[PDB]
Amino acid sequence: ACPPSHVLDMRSGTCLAAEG
Amino acid sequence: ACPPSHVLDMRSGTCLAA
Amino acid sequence: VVMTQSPSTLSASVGDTITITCRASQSIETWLAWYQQKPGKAPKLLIYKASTLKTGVPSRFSGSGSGTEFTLTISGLQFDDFATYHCQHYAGYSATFGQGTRVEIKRTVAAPSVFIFPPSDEQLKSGTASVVCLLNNFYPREAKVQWKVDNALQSGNSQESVTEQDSKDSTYSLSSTLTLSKADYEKHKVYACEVTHQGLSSPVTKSFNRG
Amino acid sequence: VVMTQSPSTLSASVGDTITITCRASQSIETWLAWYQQKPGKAPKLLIYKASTLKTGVPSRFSGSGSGTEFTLTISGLQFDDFATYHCQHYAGYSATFGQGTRVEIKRTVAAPSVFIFPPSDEQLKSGTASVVCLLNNFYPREAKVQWKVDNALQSGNSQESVTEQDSKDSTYSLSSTLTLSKADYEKHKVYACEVTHQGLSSPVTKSFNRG
Amino acid sequence: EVQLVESGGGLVKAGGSLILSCGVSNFRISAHTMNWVRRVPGGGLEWVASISTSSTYRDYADAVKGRFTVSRDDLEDFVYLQMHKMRVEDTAIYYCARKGSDRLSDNDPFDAWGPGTVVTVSPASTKGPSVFPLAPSSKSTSGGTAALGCLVKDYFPEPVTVSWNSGALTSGVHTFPAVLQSSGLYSLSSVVTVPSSSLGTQTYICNVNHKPSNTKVDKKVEPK
Amino acid sequence: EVQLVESGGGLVKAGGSLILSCGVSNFRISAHTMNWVRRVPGGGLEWVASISTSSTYRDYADAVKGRFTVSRDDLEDFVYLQMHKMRVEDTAIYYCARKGSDRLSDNDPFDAWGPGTVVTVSPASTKGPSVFPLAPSSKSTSGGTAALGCLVKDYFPEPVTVSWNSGALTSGVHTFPAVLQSSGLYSLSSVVTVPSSSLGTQTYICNVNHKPSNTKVDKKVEPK
């Protein structure tokens, strides 16, 4: 899982901040 | 005890930079 | 800095005004605290800065002192007040504590009544031997139980348990349990229990033979 | 994300070029590592980001794949290379592993020799009954042992151990110990050991009576 | 070179607790995400927990979520794993491992592992006691006061309630504080003093109740 | 109101390790110097260790310096105590306590305490093994191959060395990996297969060596 308001960017391999 | 470069000041009871 | 608390044991009655003194190895100013502790419970803060009463703590407690000598005073003991009292010096990030003072209910000296019990044949059959020595209804608390197997004194193969002051006659009781394996129990004849106590002018031995 | 490694057991010979596969439940880019682990030791990193060979690791190791399917390849097995291999997916702050592949030296199927031992009188006298079942020199590794007492099947009161492949014949051996208290051991007549293995067409049972 | 070393393993009864620490050699943990991994008896590995750099986010496996806690100490380079309400399937070898590689990047594998610490969870969360009688001597200190009782051995966990003659006898009864044996199990004794004359008529039964194990035992005590 | 709660306590053998942890309720630790204090069976209290706000300074009692390590987790409100190379005299009830009071000042007492966690260390750091024979069945699978061995029970810690006939008999032998019993002691067995015809003349002894306890046991294995 990622921290809140972060998603798993498979391309990057890291939890990225996302909005939606 | 106090950290290094500190001494115990009995009157106040706190560590002091000496 | 070493705290020397005094005495180790105080015997008193309900309603008495008693005092415990804490001695410092060097000047401490007023950085002293007093704690109460009941068996198997967390220490409770009573007095700090030598004389400041923690709010909620009954006003029959008070402390006083400065430098090397400090004193705790309970003015009119209640049943609730029988426990252990700990002094403490605190400064910087360290703390140090005294021996502790146990406060107990006063009554006459009482010698232990010693009983010795052989292990049951059922437990022996399952492979273990428990030899029990009971010290019944004694006072004061400090008592010594020594295990002797064929006159050889035992070390580190026993455990003991002590009761709190009896609500009726204010006595203590001790129970000692010598634990041996079936085979090692077969190796010896006479199993003895030696008891030293203040009310005994000399020690008391109790024993049995295997069968 | 779920990882599925295949096969569970890979049976091979020295010099062979073997392949392990690992299939991700969803697209994983190239975020995958392979690990080697020798029994009782830590996992060693071999290959990461699907195909990057970690420095120091021998070049006969190589990985490939992208998306949902990844493969580890060992070109020219050495004796040292017989161990368990794990696939790992790593992303974010978590990770998830595959079931693991154990690599073993291939030889012919061999049925175990089965032996059952009674507990010794000395141990019985001390209060514990140990009944040992020995499975001797068998291949492959999977072999199920079942304790039976008066034809009631036992559970959770036995432990077993297994040797690593033998240097000479590449076989496994298994030792299983049924532990009971003296009193429970006396309650029953027949103590059985039932062995199921690929070598045996029928489950083999060995038994004994108390004297 | 880069080394990790875990300590804290052992035997735990089910429902119990155990804490693991993990110290390091030849690197600073503050640069890395730290992980706890376990090898189960089946053979495979399971990711257990992780902390991000400076404790920003902690992640747990579903099976341990709510029960385990992972902490880190950047200044003295230590990692912790608190394990509570332990299940039998928690039995495994536990390794701490660092997220890193030869050439550090945004997303790294586990390049360095500690040797592992063994953790075994016993199925028996509870064990009932055995009650052996402490028989009185029919000949000792004349027709005066005799002592008899019950020895309660090998129970887990605390506590045990002991009463005499279905609770009818209270006078002169002493139930002793429990004692923790090197086996990891408890043992207490309960005694009573009665007149010597009452031995040859009145029977004495001690009632032992151990709520945890749902075990109630009565033991008739009589002279040998 | 203000509460603390310890966990981690139990039994350890001398030289072993135990990790303790302390959680809190209804206050934040980041505002306090945290302390470990222990109660000895003697009755009195020993100050064990302290850790200053945001970890600036860690302080230890002379008796535990070099063996204990105190850590803090300000974000999740935990304090840890690592105990290593444990001695018998470390046997005590362990309390964590905060430095504070009603009105926080420069030098505060310990106003809040956890209930305590029991830690006990056994003198025996080592235990020698017991050796029982696995006697061959003299009437079973004809005059072909017979199996016999030794059973090595209840030893701590590892390892144990087994050899047969003072190392002369090497062919056909299997020494099994040790198994950890719920008693906390290890147990392995060592077997050998031999021609059935040799049973009535050739005597078989196993040489059990346990370096930790300095124990050497030889065992005659013969048919019943």
C42: its two tokens: 């967390």
C187: its two tokens: 């190796």
User: Do the Cβ atoms of E57 and D54 come within 8 Å?
Assistant: no
Ramachandran bin of D92, using left for φ above 0, alpha for ψ from -120 to 50, beta for the remaining angles: left
The residue behind tokens 């089946």 is E42
Answer yes or no: are the C-beta atoms of F205 and F163 closer than 8 Å: no
Partners of residue F164 on adjacent β-strands: F169, F206
How many degrees, rounded to 5, is the angle at CA F219 between CA F213 and CA F224? 145
**Residue F49: closest CA among C97, B13, C95:** C95
How many degrees, rounded to 5, is the angle at CA D120 between CA D115 and CA D124? 130
**How many domains does one find in chain E?**
2
Specify the 3-state DSSP secondary structure of D183: helix
Domain ranges of chain D: 1-106, 107-211
Residues 6+ apart with CB under 8 A from E54: E30, E74
Residues E67 and E110 reside in one and the same domain: yes
Specify the 3-state DSSP secondary structure of D198: coil
How far, rounded to the nearest angstrom, does the alpha carbon of residue F42 sit from its chain's CA centroid?
24
CB atoms within 10 A of CB F167: 8
CB atoms within 10 A of CB B14: 16
The residue behind tokens 């062919």 is F171
Report the 3 state secondary structure along A1-20: CCCCCEEEECCCCEEEECCC
**Residue F161: closest CA among F219, F194, F127, F206:** F206
Report the 3 state secondary structure along chain E: CCEEEEECCEEEECCCCEEEEEEEECCCHHHCCEEEEEECCCCCEEEEEEECHHHCCEEECCCCCCCEEEEEECCCCEEEEEECCCCHHHCEEEEEEEECCCCCCCCCCEEEECCCEEEEEECCCCECCEEEEECCCCCCCCCCEEEEEEEEEEEECCCCEEEEHHHCECCCEEECCCEECCCCCEEEEEEEEEEHHHHHCCCEEEEEEEHHHCEEEEEEECCC
Residues F48 and F73 reside in one and the same domain: yes
Answer yes or no: are the C-beta atoms of E205 and E169 closer than 8 Å: no
Q: Which long-range contacts (CB under 8 A, 24 or more apart) does E101-105 make?
A: E101/D45, E101/D48, E101/D54, E102/D54, E102/D55, E104/E31
Ramachandran angles phi, psi of C121, nearest 5°: -65, -25
Answer yes or no: are the C-beta atoms of C177 and C131 closer than 8 Å: yes
Specify the 3-state DSSP secondary structure of C204: strand
Q: Are strands D32-37 and D84-91 parallel, antiparallel or unpaired?
A: antiparallel
Q: For chain E, first and last CA: distance in Å?
A: 69
Residues 6+ apart with CB under 8 A from F125: F13, F14, F15, F16
Answer yes or no: are the C-beta atoms of D43 and D86 closer than 8 Å: yes
Residues E114 and E3 reside in one and the same domain: yes
Q: Are strands E179-180 and E173-175 parallel, antiparallel or unpaired?
A: unpaired
Cα separation, F107 vs B16, in Å, equals 13
Cα separation, C103 vs C5, in Å, equals 13
E178-215 residues labelled b (16+ CB within 10 A) or e (exposed): bbbbeebbbbbbbbbbbebeebeeeebebbbebeebeb
Answer yes or no: are the C-beta atoms of D131 and D119 closer than 8 Å: yes
Residues F116 and F138 reside in one and the same domain: no
User: Between chain F and chain A, are at least 3 CB pairs below 8 A?
Assistant: no
**Residue D158: closest CA among D184, D130, D137, D134:** D130
Q: How far is CA C95 from CA B4, C33, C98, D193, F109, in A?
A: 18, 10, 11, 63, 9
CB atoms within 10 A of CB C210: 14
B18: its two tokens: 């000496």
User: Do the Cβ atoms of D90 and E113 come within 8 Å?
Assistant: no
Cα separation, D61 vs D73, in Å, equals 6
Cα separation, D197 vs D203, in Å, equals 7
Least Cα separation, residue F208 to chain C (angstroms)? 22
Least Cα separation, residue B9 to chain C (angstroms)? 8
Cα separation, D144 vs D21, in Å, equals 28
Task: Give the range of the structural domain holding residue E39, as residue numbers without chain letter.
Answer: 1-123
Specify the 3-state DSSP secondary structure of D122: helix
From F100, F123, F146, the end of a domain falls on F123
Cα separation, E157 vs D37, in Å, equals 39
Cα separation, E118 vs E92, in Å, equals 6
Partners of residue A14 on adjacent β-strands: A9
Chain D, chain E: beta-carbon pairs less than 8 Å apart: 70
Q: Are strands B7-9 and B14-16 parallel, antiparallel or unpaired?
A: antiparallel
Cα separation, E97 vs E95, in Å, equals 6
What letter would DSSP give residue D120?
A: P
Answer yes or no: are the C-beta atoms of C108 and C101 closer than 8 Å: no
Residues F136 and F112 reside in one and the same domain: no
Residues of chain D with C-beta less than 8 angstroms from the C-beta of F181: 159, 179
Q: How many CA atoms lie within 13 A of E121 on its CB side?
A: 21
Cα separation, E194 vs F58, in Å, equals 58
Any CB–CB contact under 8 A between C125 and chain D?
A: yes
Answer yes or no: are the C-beta atoms of D184 and D148 closer than 8 Å: no
Residues of chain F with C-beta less than 8 angstroms from the C-beta of D208: 137
Least Cα separation, residue E107 to chain D (angstroms)? 7
What letter would DSSP give residue F165?
A: G
Residues of chain E with C-beta less than 8 angstroms from the C-beta of D93: 33, 50, 52, 57, 59
- CATH architecture, domain D1-106: Sandwich (2.60)
Residues F104 and F174 reside in one and the same domain: no
Residue E218: CATH number of its domain: 2.60.40.10
Q: How far is CA E187 from CA C116, C176, E54, in A?
A: 18, 11, 46
F138: its two tokens: 């003299």
Could you tell me the fold of the domain covering D107-211? Answer: Immunoglobulin-like (2.60.40)
Residues F131 and F204 reside in one and the same domain: yes
Residues E111 and E193 reside in one and the same domain: no
Residues F117 and F138 reside in one and the same domain: no
Q: How far is CA C124 from CA C119, C121, C134, E184, E202, in A?
A: 7, 5, 20, 21, 27
Residues 6+ apart with CB under 8 A from E80: E19, E20, E21, E22, E69, E70, E71, E72, E73, F19, F21, F71, F73, F78, F80
How many degrees, rounded to 5, is the angle at CA E150 between CA E148 and CA E151? 125
**Residue D89: closest CA among D6, D20, D10, D25:** D25
Which of D37, D45, D99 has the CB atom closest to E111's CB atom? D45
Ramachandran angles phi, psi of F109, nearest 5°: -80, -175
Residues F134 and F116 reside in one and the same domain: no
* Residue ranges in chain C assigned as alpha helix (H): 121-126, 182-186
Cα separation, E92 vs E127, in Å, equals 23
**Residue C22: closest CA among C43, C11, C8:** C8
F154: its two tokens: 């209840």
Least Cα separation, residue D52 to chain A (angstroms)? 16
**Residue C111: closest CA among C133, C148, C143:** C143
User: Do the Cβ atoms of F106 and B14 come within 8 Å?
Assistant: yes
Least Cα separation, residue F62 to chain D (angstroms)? 36
Q: How many CA atoms lie within 13 A of A4 on its CB side?
A: 0
How many degrees, rounded to 5, is the angle at CA C187 between CA C184 and CA C191? 90
Answer yes or no: are the C-beta atoms of E36 and E144 closer than 8 Å: no
- Beta strand segments in chain C, E: 3-6, 9-12, 17-24, 32-37, 44-48, 52-53, 61-66, 69-75, 84-91, 94-97, 101-105, 113-117, 128-138, 143-149, 152-153, 158-162, 172-181, 190-197, 204-209
Cα separation, F181 vs D44, in Å, equals 29
The residue behind tokens 């293995």 is D197
* Residue ranges in chain D assigned as alpha helix (H): 121-126, 182-186
Q: For chain B, first and last CA: distance in Å?
A: 14
User: Do the Cβ atoms of E174 and C159 come within 8 Å?
Assistant: no
Q: Are strands D94-97 and D84-91 parallel, antiparallel or unpaired?
A: antiparallel
F136: its two tokens: 């061959």
Residues 6+ apart with CB under 8 A from D199: D109, D110, D111, D112, D138, D139
Q: How many helices (H) and strands (E) does chain B have?
A: 0, 2
Please name the method used to determine this structure: X-ray
- C1-106 and C107-211 have identical folds: yes
Residues F117 and F145 reside in one and the same domain: no
Cα separation, D85 vs D72, in Å, equals 9
D137-156 residues labelled b (16+ CB within 10 A) or e (exposed): bbbbbebebbbbbeeeeeee
User: Do the Cβ atoms of F44 and C45 come within 8 Å?
Assistant: no
Q: Are strands F68-73 and F78-83 parallel, antiparallel or unpaired?
A: antiparallel
User: Do the Cβ atoms of B13 and F56 come within 8 Å?
Assistant: no
From F75, F91, F123, the end of a domain falls on F123
C99: its two tokens: 């021996």
C30: its two tokens: 């007023």
Cα separation, F164 vs F173, in Å, equals 8
CA dihedral E28, E29, E33, E34 (to 10 degrees): 140
Cα separation, E162 vs E149, in Å, equals 11
Residues 6+ apart with CB under 8 A from F178: D161, F158, F159, F160, F186, F187, F188
Residues E67 and E136 reside in one and the same domain: no
Q: How many CA atoms lie within 13 A of C53 on its CB side?
A: 12
Answer yes or no: are the C-beta atoms of C71 and C19 closer than 8 Å: yes
Q: For chain C, first and last CA: distance in Å?
A: 57
